[PDB]
Symmetry: C2
Subunit: 238 residues, 2 copies
């Protein structure tokens, strides 16, 4: 399918869009730390060409928005990363609720790294999309390095009760985690911890994982193809 | 896509074929213990419609062939199960090589349970398809139950040197293991042991796993859909 790149205004932010002629569904994509709305859409080859109306926006301090983004060399890095995440979550929820209204179609969510964590924050807070792809990520915030200072109440609360520890709130929304076995930014074990926390709250067949052996912290074209099949599976179901 | 079913003769065996009107690749499918050629093709919905010419034949002692198959009550159960696997392997390689000569299309393998182990036996002996789907299975033979007697030299050889311990002979052929977390016939850990044995021999990736949380020892529609994405990714690769 031919695909047109265009900008809308939803929930008051500027969203990059890829709209197909006969859209069959929407896909809101949330990028990773140090990423951008152009970056995440480029990592989803063939999706719009198959009928998914893609939408991405820059998280706080990223892309065209005012920086600077968090620096891993700062003792306030973690706090800034999750302040960005909490803002990204609040924005995403509104972007999705509007998008649905402006385009009237089933909506799925995709997030890479920080965006996958935000996808978990959204599900834990009751957001109900038709399915979620969580790439190179986790439902627990990153291990907190020694030497950091965290005083923000929102950030402390996410560490005290990570979203993946609230599986009962996820509504069994279909969820696929896609990961690389050698990821050093989000260790494989944190993705597996997320799946094990969610397991008991998910009806059989609705929760799954795909692991590319040897891959690191990169949303590979293989992961992208598998995620595309997963969204079509739930879109064509029941 | 029009698809028709027919019986062909390849390498002297009766092969069930599901033929699309526009074949872009071949998929030889190898059923599991107590299964049959019709059962394994029925568990691959949508594959022929996407352009895969599916082929399946009955393993020794199964389906239309003189049986019965091995019975778990027998002290020679394991011996008989792996002699069926060795026979099935030798036949499958001849069927695959004839199908490739005849249709000139990229060839992939899919195996379910014992058929997944047969796919491993083929890779360990240097058969080089474009990619392999190993559903609900493992590259190691089952744990030997107490009371089993194994005298067949060919089966003893499989325990002495399981195929997954010969990763260097696999030639980095793309391989995806698809499994259910609650499978007790082939425990999840046997599939993980397979991948860990092969990992050092797949330094360029192309090895992967897909685990459906809550699924058991069945080839689920979600597994089939993910396996079709893996095959299309490798078919399209350049």
């Amino acid at each position: 399918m031919r695909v047109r790149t265009e900008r809308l205004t939803l929930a008051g932010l500027s969203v990059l869009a890829r709209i197909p002629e006969a859209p069959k569904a929407l896909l809101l994509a949330l990028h990773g730390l140090q990423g951008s709305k152009e970056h995440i859409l480029a990592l989803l080859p063939g999706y719009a060409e198959r009928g998914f109306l893609l939408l991405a926006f820059d998280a706080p301090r990223h892309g065209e928005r005012e920086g600077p983004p968090p620096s891993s060399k700062s003792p306030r890095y973690v706090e800034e990363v999750y302040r960005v995440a909490l803002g990204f979550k609040e924005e995403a929820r509104r972007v999705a609720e509007e998008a649905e209204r402006r385009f009237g179609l089933p909506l799925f969510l995709a997030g890479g790294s920080l965006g996958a964590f935000v996808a978990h924050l959204l599900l834990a807070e009751g957001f109900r999309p038709r399915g979620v792809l969580a790439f190179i990520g986790s439902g627990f915030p990153m291990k907190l390095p020694q030497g950091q200072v965290v005083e923000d109440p929102g950030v402390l609360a996410l560490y005290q009760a990570p979203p993946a520890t609230r599986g009962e709130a996820y509504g069994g929304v279909p969820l696929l985690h896609l990961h690389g076995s050698r990821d050093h930014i989000v260790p494989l074990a944190r993705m597996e911890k997320t799946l094990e926390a969610l397991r008991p709250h998910y009806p059989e067949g609705r929760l799954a994982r795909f692991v590319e052996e040897g891959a690191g912290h990169t949303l590979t074209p293989l992961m992208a193809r598998v995620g595309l099949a997963f969204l079509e599976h739930w879109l064509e179901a029941r």
